[PDB]
Design a binder for this molecule. Structure first.
Ligand code: SF4
Ligand code: SF4
Ligand code: SF4
Ligand code: SF4
Ligand code: FES
Ligand SMILES: [Mg+2]
Ligand SMILES: [Mg+2]
Ligand SMILES: [Mg+2]
Length: 581
């Protein structure tokens, strides 16, 4: 048990904890920069969390345990002068030009610069930014004129994915962050999940922009531009318009998209119901064929890359149903012309995703048919927010509108896709009706929901028991495989999401500062919007989507065979054996 003095205030406590956490718990202000996800930059501490421990001197509060007898001052002249000096030294390596910067409104560094009134000793004005910028990836971009070498991306990659695809590198004697051997991230084991972006306090890591693709299509006279947003966008984008957390902004988005000039307003949740139609049918086919088991979901492109890069032997076990993005895009170039008269070559299909890996998915060479891409552009939640703001659209004051129904209606099963276990729950609702030839009333699968990293359940389908697992985060996929859990029982159907919490925590999502992350459970609060939609929607099974039923009846035929299997499916194949590697 210990007695601590902080700024003249005595505390008696038996906690073993850092100075930073104790102070934050007790409403004592201490700044921090490189501390995130319970780690700081061990090899280059930022020291923004400096406090004074009398008799010891200046210490980093984020990684120093409280001890009995400690006398701590967090706000003395020596403390503030040290912190201001560290910020000044960061300004010496930082192109401090906030005007055009993509983190201008929510940058953690600018906040600290303002708080400590810090100024560079010599302004950093690189004349040739070409050498600092890497835009080679289909998903990520790096601007090292902004990089603080705080290490948050390196730490976040290891924690979220355990790939360590984000590394410190020695480039010509100086330290940078980047991919293995300074390669393009796409050419490495990187998942392109963008958790590194989410962890970055500044504009050093970003998504690969598709905004010019979209603007050029909107302005082209002959192009008919469809837009469709992912489940998670409607639960998240309001954060960037000062509306707070957990706000359902679906109807405002539809209105904003119309004001941006898009020609048709659809919804990827329609694609989610499509994916369930194909994937639940496939699961039932596998049950009747007594294999092959397990089936894995195939809708998360971060997981697909993880399987390609680390578990190629599982590729044959992935469901062949395209992801909602790609299945929707395929239908947008085939079914949609059939009900509209549009020339398929003039359709330009844009999605809004919470995800950077979806850009790589959309750009895969074979994601096209008859020369027409399934998906022509993917913009992140952050990109859509900037597009709205650039157009001076008053998002928070917009009236609600509706999607165009033909590829815009969605069931409550599609609505929950963006949360971990959502795909599993949605798929079970259709699979059990399909296999039992029934219209079952009990449709809620709460046992697969929530933030546990590995969630297993036994389910009864047509009077048999099957084992399902929901793998929640790429690091948890490694744990499930490396620990042998995949062999502890026979699994039949496994959902994998690369981002812990599901797509609501994807790499294209609004940044959240560390203090808000402590006060708000962002993964739960964003997901709550989706579960709330499902609870109150009339149709809660994908196969009850009336517009989807019409599309299958009039165009595709039966799911899982014939034309539907021919055009709505995509199989990944391992590389053939060769030597060397
Ligand atoms: S990263 Fe932050 S401090 Fe740096 S230029 Fe952008 S907004 Fe300004
Ligand atoms: S995209 Fe994901 S896997 Fe790649 S470096 Fe970033 S965090 Fe790591
Ligand atoms: S890219 Fe961002 S998170 Fe990574 S070290 Fe640089 S500033 Fe920190
Ligand atoms: S969990 Fe969602 S946001 Fe994250 S990589 Fe997968 S598809 Fe993208
Ligand atoms: S926040 Fe403590 S060393 Fe960076
Ligand atoms: Mg440390
Ligand atoms: Mg136009
Ligand atoms: Mg198949």
């Amino acid at each position: 048990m210990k007695t601590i003095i902080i700024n003249g205030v005595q505390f008696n406590t038996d906690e073993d904890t850092t100075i930073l956490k104790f102070a934050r718990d007790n409403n004592i202000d201490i700044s921090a920069l490189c501390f995130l996800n319970n780690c700081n930059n061990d090899i280059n501490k930022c020291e923004i969390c400096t406090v004074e421990v009398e008799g010891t001197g200046l210490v980093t509060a984020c990684d120093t345990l409280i001890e009995d007898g400690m006398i701590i001052n967090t706000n003395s002249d020596a403390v503030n002068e040290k912190i201001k000096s560290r910020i000044s030294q960061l300004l010496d390596i930082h192109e401090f030009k906030c005007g055009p910067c993509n983190r201008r409104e929510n940058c953690e560094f600018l906040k600290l610069v303002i708080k400590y009134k810090a100024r560079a000793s010599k302004p950093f004005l690189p004349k040739d930014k070409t050498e600092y910028v890497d835009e080679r990836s289909k998903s990520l971009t790096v601007d090292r004129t902004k990089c603080l070498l705080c290490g948050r991306c390196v730490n976040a990659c290891g924690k979220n994915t355990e790939t360590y695809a984000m590394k410190f590198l020695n480039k010509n004697g100086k330290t940078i962050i980047g991919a293995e051997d300074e390669k393009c991230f796409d050419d490495t084991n990187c998942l392109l999940c963008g958790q590194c972006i989410i962890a970055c306090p500044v504009a050093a890591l970003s998504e690969k922009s598709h905004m010019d693709r979209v603007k050029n299509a909107l302005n082209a006279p002959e192009k008919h531009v469809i837009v469709a947003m992912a489940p998670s966008v409607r639960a998240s984008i309001g954060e960037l318009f000062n509306m707070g957390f957990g706000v359902d902004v679906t109807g405002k988005i539809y209105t904003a998209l119309r004001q941006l000039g898009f020609d048709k307003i659809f919804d990827i949740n329609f694609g989610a119901d499509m994916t369930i139609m194909e994937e639940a049918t496939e699961l039932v086919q596998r049950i009747e064929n007594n294999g092959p088991f397990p089936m894995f979901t195939s809708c998360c492109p971060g997981w697909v890359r993880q399987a390609e890069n680390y578990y190629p032997e599982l590729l044959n076990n992935l469901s062949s149903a395209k992801s909602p993005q790609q299945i929707f895009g395929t239908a947008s170039k085939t079914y949609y012309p059939s009900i509209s008269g549009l020339d398929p070559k003039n359709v330009f299909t844009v999605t809004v995703m919470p995800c950077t890996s979806k850009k790589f998915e959309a750009d895969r060479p074979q994601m096209e048919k008859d020369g027409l891409r399934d998906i022509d552009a993917v913009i992140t939640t952050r990109e859509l927010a900037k597009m709205i703001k650039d157009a001076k659209i008053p998002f928070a004051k917009l009236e609600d509108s509706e999607a165009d129904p033909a590829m815009g209606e969605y069931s409550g099963a599609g609505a929950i896709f963006g949360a971990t276990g959502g795909v599993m729950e949605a798929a079970l609702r259709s699979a059990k009706d399909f296999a039992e030839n029934a219209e079952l009333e009990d449709i809620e699968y709460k046992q697969v929901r929530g933030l546990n990293g590995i969630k297993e359940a036994e389910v009864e389908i047509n009077n048999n028991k099957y084992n399902v697992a929901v793998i929640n985060g790429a690091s948890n996929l490694f744990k499930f495989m490396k620990s042998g859990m995949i062999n502890e029982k026979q699994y039949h159907f496994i959902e994998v999401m690369a981002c812990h919490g599901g797509c609501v925590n994807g790499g294209g999502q609004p940044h959240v500062n560390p203090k808000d992350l402590e006060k708000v459970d962002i993964k739960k609060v964003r997901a709550s919007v989706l579960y709330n939609q499902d609870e109150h929607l009339s149709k809660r099974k994908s196969h009850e989507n009336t517009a989807l039923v019409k599309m299958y009846q009039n165009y595709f035929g039966k799911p899982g065979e014939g034309r539907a299997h021919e055009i709505l499916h995509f199989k990944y194949k391992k590389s053939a054996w060769s030597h060397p590697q």
